[PDB]
Design an enzyme around this catalytic site. Structure first.
Site, PDB file in Angstrom:
ATOM      1  N   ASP A   1       3.846 123.466  -1.669  1.00 13.99           N
ATOM      2  CA  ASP A   1       3.574 122.464  -0.671  1.00 13.99           C
ATOM      3  C   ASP A   1       3.290 123.237   0.595  1.00 13.99           C
ATOM      4  O   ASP A   1       4.212 123.676   1.286  1.00 13.99           O
ATOM      5  CB  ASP A   1       4.778 121.592  -0.461  1.00 13.99           C
ATOM      6  CG  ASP A   1       4.568 120.420   0.482  1.00 13.99           C
ATOM      7  OD1 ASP A   1       3.716 120.447   1.366  1.00 13.99           O
ATOM      8  OD2 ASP A   1       5.287 119.450   0.311  1.00 13.99           O
ATOM      9  N   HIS A   2       2.023 123.285   0.973  1.00 13.31           N
ATOM     10  CA  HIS A   2       1.641 124.101   2.101  1.00 13.31           C
ATOM     11  C   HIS A   2       2.143 123.597   3.445  1.00 13.31           C
ATOM     12  O   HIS A   2       2.026 124.311   4.442  1.00 13.31           O
ATOM     13  CB  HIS A   2       0.126 124.239   2.124  1.00 13.31           C
ATOM     14  CG  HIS A   2      -0.341 125.438   2.950  1.00 13.31           C
ATOM     15  ND1 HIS A   2       0.357 126.300   3.685  1.00 13.31           N
ATOM     16  CD2 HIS A   2      -1.655 125.809   3.063  1.00 13.31           C
ATOM     17  CE1 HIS A   2      -0.468 127.152   4.225  1.00 13.31           C
ATOM     18  NE2 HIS A   2      -1.677 126.850   3.845  1.00 13.31           N
TER      19      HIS A   2
END
Lengths: 243, 243
Positions: free
Chosen positions: B215-216
């Site tokens: 999850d950037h």
């Protein structure tokens, strides 16, 4: 026990008397107590630490960043805590009634430190729960306090087993004395490159000599041979401890 | 979101309708929820497991005596629990306020099992505290219950990270989808012998492909590259976990 006859040592030459520290005297007394109480057997084995050594030396970076020195002693301590849980008769003591063994469910291990004043065996508690760098840190601290007489008597109690490492000085093997009421002690001597038959030719392997003396009332020959064998196996591949 | 236009598939030929199990439908819904919520990046790495494999195969004896099969999965689980403690941003979740991360102080890890009815991700609790044979045992049990629909919903909750291993079927790498609210998932594909430059010539090493999607919003590029690197390092020598 018959006493040794006194000899006038000065008939033969010049003599000088130096006294014993109270530490020496205590030590003397305790060793003689063990000696007379414990029927001693030493079991010898050699462990292949070629790969342990390579690991040790490769983690020099990480050890330095953590402020510890990674010696063979934390590795020895970790592997013996694991075995002391596997083979519980080694982690026990003869009960005063002579008819029971007290199995300890905890693993605290002492290691011998030779100081100016005599021998001290600081104890690391719950070796089974600490990591190789925790143990490397703590071993050193207890060692410095021991040399500096700053080691409080508390830290010298309730050990289950003792490791005595002379590998740093030399020697092939020795027969250590059991620190009763414990039932065994691991002596470790100097590691040498040895030819080890691979089934077809002799391969140089770095061999560490192990000398396990034990209380033969509590431990029989086969149990002790099985203990140094397992230990030789664990030091040849410390990953088996992960299993 | 714009809908896909309906197509009369039968204009082009014979069609047949088969229905989706409620499991498929649930799965579909959850994947789409993650997909739209999580800006996904996959970081690829290869780990040298030549020595892990040798260890695995040598402990076949011990594993058989304990009734387990030692696969790469317990090894993967142990190494990721260790890293999840070292790099805590991977063991956390975005708080509903969007302004806080909830760091979990526990390590429970799910692994994907593909069953007839759809995908289930059983969760092993406190991976960080279990040994390689404990984890091998438990993984198998949860897997059998999953295939047999005997897996109770309880055992599907509160995971911190997911491993998806397709190494047994094949493939070079893939880009897995994050199971939100978790923040990362490790995909593992088939291991191959690869030439790896030793500074002078190419040595065949057994390489395992790792694909970490994250999850950037929570994990940046450098943190993820650092995670797969450390993991490549830990699998190349699992003894570093002992430190």
């Amino acid at each position: 026990i018959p006493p040794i006859p006194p000899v006038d040592f000065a008939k033969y030459g010049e003599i000088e008397e130096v006294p014993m520290t109270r530490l020496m005297q205590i030590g003397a007394t305790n060793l003689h107590r063990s000696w007379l109480n414990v029927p001693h057997v030493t079991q010898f084995e050699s462990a292949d630490i070629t790969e342990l050594e390579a690991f040790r030396v490769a983690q020099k970076a990480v050890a330095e960043k953590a402020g510890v020195k990674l010696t063979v002693l934390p590795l020895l301590l970790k592997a013996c805590a694991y075995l002391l849980k596997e083979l519980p008769d080694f982690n026990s003591s003869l009960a005063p009634s002579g008819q029971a063994l007290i199995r300890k469910k905890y693993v605290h291990i002492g290691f011998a430190v030779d100081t100016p004043d005599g021998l001290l065996v600081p104890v690391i508690r719950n070796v089974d729960q600490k990591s190789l760098l925790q143990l490397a840190a703590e071993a050193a601290e207890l060692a410095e306090k021991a040399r500096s007489k700053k080691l409080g008597a508390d830290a010298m109690q309730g050990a289950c087993f003792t490791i005595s490492s002379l590998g740093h000085i030399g020697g092939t093997a020795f027969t250590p004395i059991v620190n009763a009421p414990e039932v065994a002690i691991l002596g470790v001597s100097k590691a040498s490159m040895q030819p080890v038959w691979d089934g077809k030719a002799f391969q140089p392997r770095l061999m560490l000599p192990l000398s396990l003396s034990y209380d033969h009332r509590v431990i029989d020959g086969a149990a002790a041979a099985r203990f140094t064998k397992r230990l030789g196996d664990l030091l040849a591949d410390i990953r088996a401890i992960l299993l």
